[PDB]
Amino acid sequence: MFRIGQGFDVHQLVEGRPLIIGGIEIPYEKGLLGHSDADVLLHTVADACLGAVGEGDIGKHFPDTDPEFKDADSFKLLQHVWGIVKQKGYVLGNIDCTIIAQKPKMLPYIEDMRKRIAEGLEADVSQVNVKATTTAEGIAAQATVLIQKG
Amino acid sequence: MFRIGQGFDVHQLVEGRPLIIGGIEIPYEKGLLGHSDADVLLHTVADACLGAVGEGDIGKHFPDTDPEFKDADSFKLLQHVWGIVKQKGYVLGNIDCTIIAQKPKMLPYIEDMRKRIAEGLEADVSQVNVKATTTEKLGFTGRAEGIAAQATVLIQKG
Amino acid sequence: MFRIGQGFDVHQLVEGRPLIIGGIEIPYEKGLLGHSDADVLLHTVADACLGAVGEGDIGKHFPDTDPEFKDADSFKLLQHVWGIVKQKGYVLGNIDCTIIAQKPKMLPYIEDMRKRIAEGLEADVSQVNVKATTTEKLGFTGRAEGIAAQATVLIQKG
Ligand SMILES: [Mg+2]
Ligand SMILES: [Mg+2]
Ligand SMILES: [Mg+2]
Structure with a gap:
């Protein structure tokens, strides 16, 4: 068995916050706006994985409203x-x-x-x-994942 | 043997139509414009499925010109x-x-x-x-x- | 083993260039703008394929700045x-x-x-x-x- 997932996200650019993408801090004058670190690539990867197994999305597991996931490390x-x-x-x-x-x-x-x-x-x-x-x-970021039994 | 398919669609929101998405009626003061019920999510699911078996898209099977699909149920x-x-x-x-x-x-x-x-x-x-x-x-x-919607499907022999 | 790949590309329609899509020359007033023949569909197919094997994108193999990418045949x-x-x-x-x-x-x-x-x-x-x-x-x-074009590919051991 294989299963497929897809993720797509967009985050707003803004001054003062750091730019973190795919778990790597990138020197830049504007970071992405978000309640966690806002890594839009790691969010997309996570959503593709959640979607492949039928478990909704990262909003369902780490809601924006949950103070536990304020400044959360997206890795x-x-x-x-x-x-x-x-x-x-x-x-x-x-x-x-x-x-x-x-x-x-x-x-x-x-x-x-x-x-x-x-x-x-x-x-x-x-x-x-x-x-x-x-x-x-x-x-923005897009990801497509293929997972397999193992 | 597995096959992949992918669908992408986008419909305009207008005053004075029902909102039907994923086969579900959403009470809302705007809805989607199209020849059929405009169900953007079921159109992309259907396109993904057709794509996966090499049978084109919904346009091929249910064209906007052919008048019999007017207000058709996307389900x-x-x-x-x-x-x-x-x-x-x-x-x-x-x-x-x-x-x-x-x-x-x-x-x-x-x-x-x-x-x-x-x-x-x-x-x-x-x-x-x-x-x-x-x-x-x-x-x-x-x-x-x-x-807009997107769908990715994996089908398998069975 | 099966591997998946995805490609996405967009090119501008501009005056006085051929329109080559999917390797096919289509009669039209405008063509797509780029360094190569700008075949947006074959670019996305190529990207999906490279993506499936972990080899980057077409830019890694045929940079814009490479003189053989100029007017290259995307097929x-x-x-x-x-x-x-x-x-x-x-x-x-x-x-x-x-x-x-x-x-x-x-x-x-x-x-x-x-x-x-x-x-x-x-x-x-x-x-x-x-x-x-x-x-x-x-x-x-x-x-x-x-x-614009998108492509999703499933490849298998063969
Ligand atoms: Mg996000
Ligand atoms: Mg449609
Ligand atoms: Mg290109």
């Missing part, structure tokens, strides 16, 4: 989501993710995002793909 | 599409779907959509995921001009 | 990508693609794009699905600024 939240997936008997097949952002340039941080995502999904880096495009009020 | 269209998938030898593995909408809030109706989609794919509700998110006021859906 | 680029997939031991499961464009009407060329993509992926036409949808006048594609 920790991904680890908990991955606990839910493992409990259903699944491991990672592979994941393919896209960051949509006009600025900053993501290329110098992509390889550490992949390591970080792999770590959070307990997989090898060869199972994780991250790309960026630009095509500027926010940063 | 009924989904069942006809599911008939095509079954004839090819496939059943549902699982489906993950996203509604993209600033308003209204979808969360009270999610479980019902999942039930209705499960019924249309002849599947267990554990096989169907539906989530709703906003674009944080950004874009055509962010400013309530329309509702 | 040849797809064949290069497919060689990468084949060296890892995979063949096509199936692919489902969507062209989002307000105009022109894709429907007369779809079958040819399917055959071309099938040829590039060394597969049967039954494994390739391509659908075309308009945006209902909404967004950047809805206001004829461009053409």
